[PDB]
């Protein structure tokens, strides 16, 4: 049982946009499929509907005239268009699978997909600038010292950050993304480590940002 | 003489459902899943109506 979904991006307010939705592990030709929406932060949103045969289409009244659901049985895939975007469509969507087989009523969500991300703003796409926060030279002998990585100026969310591919975990602060004045994300991440340890053992933190294919990995040296 | 003035139906409509259902993929591994512990069971079919189950005889 599986429900891959696939289309999500960053599209200017105004335009179109449409995700489409694979099913695998049941008999997809049977179900009625939702999509429903989730703004950051906030509650579920009823999207729209279909049914088994592809025949009944409900959508929500906030988003009717402008999505369109259909449905493609031979290949077990579901597409969601929508165009004339408003920002207010800024959510993560979801595809599900109805409870209930063979029905033109529909009752409920019981398989729900992985989602996808659909951002409206009208900025665009930009990868992050990984710049070190170096460890002081004035560290105790002792002696507990710190490092890190700043990522800067990236669009949309997220990023994920590690520490040596995932060898370092512990004591790694990755603090929540704050969004500058330039409309443009930023977060740290910090670790603190023995200061005998600096000079011995290579710290390199490891950036991905999805959205615009960016991997970087950034060596942090005193 | 008055057979012909009744209406035609299907007498099996109800169980050809029942099949009809249970011919989805999975479905199957349900009832085997609920028929596990014990021999009879009540199973939520995925078209919604619960239905008993019962499993007469054991040859695996």
């Known amino acids: 049982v599986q429900l891959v979904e696939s289309g999500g991006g960053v599209v200017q307010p105004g335009r179109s946009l449409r995700l489409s939705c694979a099913a695998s592990?049941?008999?997809?030709?049977?179900?009625?499929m939702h999509w429903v929406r989730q703004a950051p932060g906030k509650g579920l949103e009823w999207v729209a509907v279909?049914?088994?045969?592809?025949?009944?289409?409900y959508y929500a009244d906030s988003v009717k005239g402008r999505f369109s659901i259909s449905r493609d049985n031979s290949k077990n895939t579901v597409s969601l268009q929508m165009n004339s975007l408003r920002p207010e469509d800024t959510a993560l969507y979801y595809c599900?699978?109805?409870?209930?087989?063979?029905?033109?009523?529909?009752?409920?969500?019981?398989?729900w997909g992985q989602g996808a991300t659909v951002t409206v703003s009208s900025a665009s796409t930009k990868g992050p600038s990984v710049f070190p926060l170096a460890p002081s030279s004035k560290s105790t002998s002792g002696g507990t010292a710190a490092l890190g990585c700043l990522v800067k100026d990236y669009f949309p969310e997220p990023v994920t950050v590690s520490w040596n591919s995932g060898a370092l975990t512990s004591g790694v602060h990755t603090f929540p993304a704050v969004l500058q004045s330039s409309g443009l994300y930023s977060l740290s991440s910090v670790v603190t480590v023995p200061s005998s340890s600096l000079g011995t053992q290579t710290y390199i933190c490891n950036v991905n940002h999805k959205p615009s294919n960016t991997k970087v990995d950034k060596k942090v040296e005193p | 003489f008055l057979g012909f003035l009744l209406g035609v139906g299907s007498a099996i409509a109800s169980g050809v459902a029942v099949c009809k259902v249970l011919h989805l993929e999975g479905e199957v591994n349900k009832i085997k899943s609920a028929l596990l512990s014990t021999n009879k069971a009540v199973v939520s079919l995925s078209n919604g109506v619960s239905v008993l189950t019962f499993k007469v005889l054991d040859l695996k």
């Open positions: 599900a699978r109805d409870r209930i087989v063979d029905d033109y009523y529909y009752y409920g969500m019981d398989v």
């Open positions: 592990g049941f008999s997809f030709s049977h179900y009625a």
């Open positions: 279909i049914s088994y045969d592809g025949e009944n289409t």
